[PDB]
Design a protein around this ligand. Structure first.
Ligand code: SF4
Ligand code: SF4
Ligand code: SF4
Lengths: 147, 55, 193, 352, 206, 393, 110
């Protein structure tokens, strides 16, 4: 390719959830993230190997229990949702809140379908998933690639 | 194959060849074999076709 | 007195040139030997049958023994239970391990009686933030990676899994096995003569 | 085909003041040599980077481009893009002028390397002697980089850069005097047109002299003390961060390329597939031009290869083991070679 | 007291650019600073020995353009390799800050992102390098497989590409600084040479 | 911008940020015209508090800490931390687990000498042997990763009553293949070095201690044995499975860097001579034949007895080490590791101590720099096999 | 020579910044709260930090000028900043830089 415009942004605004099959070098995908930030979208990657039910961390409010090491007996923190807090901490002229997941291979079909269905509800919110693979950066709707 | 059922491996192209192990979890066609042996219990995902449901 | 000095001078010179050309020929010989490099992202390396990567966890087999905390060097895993009153059972309400703190000594795995808590071959852990490494009960099972089942990898065995006499693991037949017979084969061999 | 002639005549056909026409052909080769110099730097960097991996059963860059072809591109573009920092008490004029002084004359000495007959810039009657002169300016830039820095760690290792560069210019001069005997002068075209069917066979000793004095121009791990990374971190370079460090880097590799091309023209020749060429006509001139260019680059490449291949074969030397080569092995032997060639040219003036 | 440790809700958002001729050049800019990260040889513990094995020939990291560099000024990356005690920490901030501005960090090991095993019952360990410098990528594990470091570098390389060229304002220091006169009686330095030339080493007392 | 020279000795800082591997270490050195009068070595940049962490941590809880003292070889110290409470309780150790202990621990000695050799040559010029050791030292990583889980360090393979885990199936003949592949290569190194003049002229006679001057300063390791002293705790202390093997303890007498190099490089061959002689003598041989011969008939036979098991009674995390103090020791690569253990009545010890060889060996850095040069320092500092991690106690 | 306490978002020295140098004077005690912009500062909370520093040097300091003491001061300031950042005066910057929560993640105060 060696040069690409903004058709990725149109594909994302159309489908809602894409799936990148970038190479295992991580050098030729952040530019599309830039093309998104060049429009008004704001990003937050949070590395799916570390996300749980994906209904408690995105929609609902969940309880994180930090590491006690013999000291400071068990305690909760109750961090707020990742998708109703950053979505409200946007700037004024914000088109939406895209969502990046670096390691998508470790997740399963069910939460792929959940993230896809979650694009329609909760409108100003989009999703991208870096399911590693192909030697040329191509993408596909995430409702597809499953069933 | 279903959970809780001991199995073994039938795949000469795999380092875990002819080990017996108990199935732990199954999601999306790939099953997590648990090799109770040695000292540390090891856990690995195999396809259903690499396995053989031994008695 | 003076001629001997010049001869020793020339002798030192010649011996130095020779001992330099020796290493010259050695290095010029190393540049035909195949690279033992492991072109990792496309030519990943297969971990052993005892490597200690990420910890696994089932929610149904735990019985809240607190051995995991009482045995970890730093009392890391966060067990949280409430003791429902049907008769005696400790009900396990939450379980996490901060893998930014965990040391991968796997004594947790060693003393869990239920075979709930195991080691996986995930060595590809990394984040842009350390509050994402705190893996929850539903994010610790999560069905590990299995390097071989990756469409863009050429796996390699390591020195303990290569045939006898073989040293590298790059250009290998597609039927290679470790070194020798398993004990089952030896037993069925001695039984059959 | 005398491209100068056609360029001037075709440009003199639409006028443009024939003197001005002869003036306007100047920058073309003057920048073409910059092109091949920069390309030689890129090639030298990539070559060292892959051959130092072949020596070690390693594989150099292959994810930059296909085969690391675009690695020094990335390096240079980065070092443009990096911040520059001028430390606290360092001088502002000398700091950003040291690397220019040590880099410039190595480029300026590309006005003598032939690549082919009448395919160079301005054959000087002085030639190699001007290179021996201009190469002695580098220690000034090195001492400038040393003084123009509050880093005693730097100046302590920038003085030893003006201790070897000021030590391997005398035998470097004597080994080329031994060639100036044979060749009726000092011009490169005259050093090499003396080969019509090579000086290495008649300078079996001065080869080692020139070639050890050229490797030891603060270049390679046999010595390269002023960049002794393990002894004292990067010597004089450790306060140079952005494009200035790139100037030093560029300067080292481009000087190495110059040394290779210059050994080629002195002792072997930038022509002469070793048969007595020209025994076998524009379409033939454009063929022998390419042949001479190609063979020049073959020999220059072989010397670049041997030079980088000593870097990974030959542990360094402190400073006393170094300076006991100069004045104790290279200078007496260069004098002996000079006297030998003189006596032989006096007795056997044929063949010289 | 409603959302502790909160987010700040910025305004005047970022005013990014959109023309193609600039964003392609931005891609080249990022690719160039990306594919030639030059680390700093910074070793303190066995994480450095795994980094040394990463240098080696079983699997190098010379490819995708990394040259282990010896000084900070030429460098672009501190792969923080080992435990940071309370006596070497300023010798790490003075290596990080004493470096050109477009610089990144990787925190390999668990003894340098939470203190690891020494996160408890230790009195001289820094329990996280993220309270000394802005860590950019975390990888866990006392000694991690040094090919996991290359996963971290993959993950760092897909973050250098996530940058923009008209956004270098988030790359300098504001220096919100003050002054204060005091009275704390300066003492002489007891840290000099004088290990054998001291009079007490050449002197059995009376 | 300039520095204002003067007729006084110059002070320079070889700070924590070495461009090398030899830990983090200061050497505030004062010189008289490219000489060395003395230097204050300000070590301390890696004290994280072992000896007070070892008082809220029982044995099995503390054993992964133990492999961070010698980052190069994390089994000369797991072994000692095992042997310390093991002697008080008087727990008998079998011959199988102790031969495994010998094999793995001596293989770690090989690794230790290789990691000494690499930066020793990098600081003394070329970097190629640094790449030739991680081409070779990387195979024992795979051996350990097969037997234990992790590689160099953090194995935590050893236990009080013996060894944690019996070996893998194809470990023994593969270790034989490595043993046979190694001897041709310690010779290829001696083709590339040991006569190259630019190398041997660099460290001819730098550094020297007399026999009795190397015994006041207590240079317990090869430095003490590279000055005319036949003394190794594998032989004089009758360490566990010894006097059963052949022995040739190397000794030099020059006291200089050659006297250390030759000793190390002969030791890394004598070690293989031990290993080849141990694999041919296990109680059970390879685990394949052992397990097969057990299951064939030996549900009661003598191939399931105590001396053929890899451990005695596996213990709890409440072992409760008894009362009484003692000092255990082990001859590692750097020299004598040692532990002064006391115990009161409980799982938590009382004054866990480490006596590392690197500490005492690195005492005499400046005497060796009693007027040598600025640029032959690293050649001396690279001679001890200094691991600053072993100076955290 | 200097005697400094360089934590994250607190750097304390013992000289007087003239234009970007420091020039150790033995009595000026500069400060450089949050250079890396981990936090977004107001005019009030920053003044509270300033006043804490002033009444923490002068009010309790009459002993030697070791780095131990400056490090203790930096620790007290880095805990005071936790207090300000929990109570909710100041907050994280949110910018497209690192965004590593060195102090803590966001809670809700139930
Ligand atoms: S050791 Fe096993 S059963 Fe006990 S708390 Fe941990 S996971 Fe649950
Ligand atoms: S691996 Fe070690 S530190 Fe981690 S949970 Fe298990 S016992 Fe605890
Ligand atoms: S994290 Fe592990 S490898 Fe790194 S310094 Fe700590 S103990 Fe050593």
């Amino acid at each position: 390719g060696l040069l690409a415009g903004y058709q990725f942004v149109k594909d994302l605004e159309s489908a809602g959830a894409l799936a990148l099959f970038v190479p295992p070098e991580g050098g030729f995908e952040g530019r599309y993230q830039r093309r998104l930030r060049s429009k008004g979208y704001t990003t937050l990657p949070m590395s799916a190997p570390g996300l749980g039910d994906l209904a408690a961390y995105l929609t609902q409010e969940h309880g994180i229990r930090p590491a006690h090491t013999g000291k400071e007996d068990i305690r909760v923190y109750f961090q707020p949702p990742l998708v109703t807090y950053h979505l409200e901490n946007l700037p004024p002229n914000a088109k939406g809140l895209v969502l990046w997941l670096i390691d998508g291979k470790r997740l399963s079909k069910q939460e792929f379908a959940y993230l896809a269905q979650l694009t329609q509800t909760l409108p100003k919110f989009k999703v991208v998933v870096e399911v590693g693979g192909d030697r040329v950066v191509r993408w596909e709707p995430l409702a597809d690639w499953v069933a | 194959i279903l959970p809780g059922m001991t199995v073994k491996v039938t795949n000469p192209n795999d380092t875990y060849y002819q080990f017996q192990g108990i199935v732990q979890r199954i999601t999306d066609g790939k099953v997590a074999v648990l090799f109770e042996g040695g000292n540390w219990d090891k856990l690995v995902t195999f396809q259903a076709s690499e396995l053989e449901p031994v008695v | 007195k003076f001629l001997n000095q010049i001869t020793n001078y020339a002798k030192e010179a010649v011996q130095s040139a020779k001992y330099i050309g020796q290493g010259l020929s050695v290095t010029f010989d190393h540049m035909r030997r195949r690279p033992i490099t492991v072109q990792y992202p496309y030519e990943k390396l297969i971990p052993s049958e005892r490597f200690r990567g990420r910890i696994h966890f089932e929610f149904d087999k735990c019985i809240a023994c607190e051995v995991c905390v009482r045995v970890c060097p730093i009392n890391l895993p966060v067990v949280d239970w409430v003791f429902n009153k049907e008769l005696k059972k400790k009900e396990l309400k939450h379980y996490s391990i901060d893998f930014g703190v965990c040391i991968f000594c796997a004594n947790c795995v060693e003393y869990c009686p239920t075979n709930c808590l195991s080691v996986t071959e995930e060595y590809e852990l990394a984040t842009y933030d350390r509050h994402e490494l705190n893996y929850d009960s539903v994010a610790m099972g999560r069905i590990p990676y299995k390097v071989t089942q990756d469409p863009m990898v050429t796996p390699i065995r390591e020195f303990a899994y290569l045939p006898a006499g073989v040293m590298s693991g790059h250009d290998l037949p597609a039927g290679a096995q470790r070194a020798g017979e398993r004990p089952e084969a030896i037993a069925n061999t001695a039984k059959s003569s | 085909i005398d491209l100068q002639g056609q360029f001037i005549s075709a440009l003199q056909s639409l006028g443009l003041s024939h003197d001005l026409a002869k003036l306007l052909w100047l920058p073309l080769p003057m920048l073409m040599m910059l092109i091949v110099a920069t390309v030689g730097v890129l090639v030298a960097v990539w070559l060292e980077r892959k051959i130092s991996a072949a020596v070690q059963q390693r594989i150099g860059p292959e994810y930059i481009g296909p085969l690391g072809i675009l690695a020094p591109l990335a390096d240079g573009l980065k070092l443009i893009f990096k911040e520059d920092v001028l430390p606290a008490n360092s001088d502002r004029w000398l700091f950003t002028l040291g690397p220019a002084v040590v880099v410039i004359p190595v480029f300026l000495s590309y006005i003598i390397v032939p690549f082919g007959q009448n395919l160079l810039i301005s054959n000087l009657a002085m030639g190699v002697f001007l290179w021996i002169a201009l190469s002695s300016i580098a220690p000034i830039g090195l001492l400038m980089a040393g003084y123009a820095s509050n880093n005693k760690y730097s100046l302590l290792g920038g003085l030893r850069a003006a201790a070897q560069s000021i030590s391997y210019e005398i035998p470097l001069a004597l080994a080329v005097l031994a060639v100036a005997m044979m060749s009726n002068g000092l011009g490169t075209v005259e050093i090499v047109e003396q080969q019509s069917q090579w000086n290495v066979w008649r300078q079996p000793i001065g080869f080692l002299v020139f070639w050890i004095a050229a490797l030891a121009e603060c270049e390679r791990l046999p010595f390269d003390l002023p960049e002794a990374e393990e002894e004292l971190v990067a010597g004089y370079q450790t306060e140079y961060a952005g494009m200035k460090f790139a100037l030093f880097y560029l300067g080292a590799y481009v000087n190495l390329v110059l040394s290779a091309l210059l050994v080629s023209v002195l002792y072997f020749g930038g022509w002469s597939f070793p048969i007595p060429l020209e025994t076998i006509n524009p379409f033939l001139q454009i063929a022998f031009a390419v042949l001479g260019i190609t063979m020049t680059l073959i020999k220059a490449y072989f010397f670049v290869f041997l030079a980088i291949l000593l870097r990974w074969t030959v542990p360094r030397v402190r400073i006393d083991q170094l300076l006991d080569l100069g004045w104790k092995f290279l200078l007496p032997v260069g004098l002996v070679n000079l006297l030998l060639t003189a006596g032989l040219k006096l007795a056997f003036p044929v063949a010289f | 007291p409603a959302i502790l440790n909160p987010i700040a809700r910025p305004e005047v958002p970022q005013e990014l650019a959109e023309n193609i001729i600039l964003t392609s050049l931005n891609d080249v800019y990022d690719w160039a600073r990306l594919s030639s990260l030059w680390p700093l040889m910074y070793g303190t513990a066995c994480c450095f020995i795994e980094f040394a094995a990463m240098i080696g020939s079983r699997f190098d990291f010379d490819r995708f353009g990394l040259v282990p560099r010896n000084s900070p000024r030429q460098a672009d990356l501190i792969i923080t390799s080992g435990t940071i005690t309370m006596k070497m920490a300023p010798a790490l901030v003075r290596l990080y800050e004493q470096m050109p501005s477009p610089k990144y960090v990787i925190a390999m090991g668990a003894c340098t992102i939470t203190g690891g095993m020494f996160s408890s019952d230790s009195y001289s360990a820094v329990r996280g390098v993220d309270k000394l410098i802005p860590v950019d990528v975390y990888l866990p594990g006392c000694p991690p497989r040094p090919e996991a470091i290359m996963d971290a570098i993959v993950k760092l390389r897909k973050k250098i590409a996530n940058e923009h060229i008209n956004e270098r304002g988030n790359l300098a220091q504001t220096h919100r600084l003050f002054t204060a006169k005091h009275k704390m009686k300066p003492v002489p330095p007891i840290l000099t040479g004088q290990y054998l030339n001291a009079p007490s080493r050449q002197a059995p007392p009376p | 911008p300039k520095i204002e020279t003067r007729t006084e000795p110059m002070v320079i800082n070889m700070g924590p940020h070495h461009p090398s591997m030899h830990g983090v270490l200061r050497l505030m050195v004062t010189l008289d015209g490219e000489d060395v009068i003395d230097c204050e070595p300000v070590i301390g940049y890696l004290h994280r508090g072992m000896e007070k962490i070892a008082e809220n941590r029982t044995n099995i809880m503390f054993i992964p800490y133990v492999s961070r003292w010698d980052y190069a070889a994390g089994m000369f110290n797991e072994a000692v931390t095992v042997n310390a409470p093991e002697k008080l309780a008087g727990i008998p150790v079998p011959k199988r687990a102790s031969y495994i202990r010998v094999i793995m621990l001596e293989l770690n000695r090989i690794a230790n000498h290789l990691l000494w050799l690499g930066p020793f040559l990098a600081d003394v010029g070329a970097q190629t042997p640094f790449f030739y050791i991680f081409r070779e030292r990387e195979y024992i990583y795979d051996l350990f990763e097969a037997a234990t889980g992790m590689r160099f360090i953090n194995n935590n393979y050893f236990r009080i009553g013996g060894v944690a885990a019996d070996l893998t199936y194809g470990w023994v003949t593969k270790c034989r293949d490595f043993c046979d592949y190694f001897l041709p290569k310690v010779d290829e190194y001696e083709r590339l070095i040991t006569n190259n003049p630019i190398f041997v002229r660099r460290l001819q006679g730098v550094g020297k201690i007399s026999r009795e001057e190397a015994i006041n300063w207590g240079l317990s390791g090869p430095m003490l044995r590279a000055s005319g002293v036949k003394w190794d705790l594998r032989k004089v202390d009758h360490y566990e499975c010894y006097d059963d093997f052949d022995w040739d303890v190397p000794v030099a007498t020059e006291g200089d860097c050659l006297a250390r190099y030759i000793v190390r490089i002969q030791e890394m061959r004598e070690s293989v001579k031990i290993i080849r002689q141990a694999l041919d003598g296990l109680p059970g041989g390879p685990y394949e034949n052992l397990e097969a011969k057990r299951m064939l008939e030996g549900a009661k036979s003598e191939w399931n007895g105590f001396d053929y098991q890899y451990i005695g009674k596996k213990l709890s995390p409440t072992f409760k080490i008894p009362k009484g103090e003692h000092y255990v020791r082990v001859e590692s690569g750097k020299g004598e590791l040692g532990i002064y253990l006391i115990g009161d009545d409980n799982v938590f010890p009382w004054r866990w101590k480490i006596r590392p060889p690197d500490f005492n060996n690195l005492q005499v850095l400046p005497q060796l720099l009693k007027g040598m040069k600025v640029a032959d320092i690293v050649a001396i500092l690279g001679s001890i096999d200094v691991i600053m991690g072993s100076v955290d106690r | 020579m200097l005697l400094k306490s360089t934590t994250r978002h607190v750097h304390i020295y013992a000289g007087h910044v003239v234009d970007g140098e420091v020039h150790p004077d033995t009595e000026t005690l500069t400060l450089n709260v949050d250079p890396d912009n981990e936090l977004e500062w107001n005019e009030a909370a920053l003044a509270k930090v300033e006043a804490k520093f002033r009444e923490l040097v002068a009010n309790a300091a009459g002993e030697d000028l070791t780095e131990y003491n400056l490090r203790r001061i930096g620790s007290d300031l880095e805990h005071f900043i936790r207090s300000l950042l929990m109570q909710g005066e100041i907050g994280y910057n949110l910018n497209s830089r690192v965004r590593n929560y060195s102090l803590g993640i966001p809670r809700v105060n139930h």
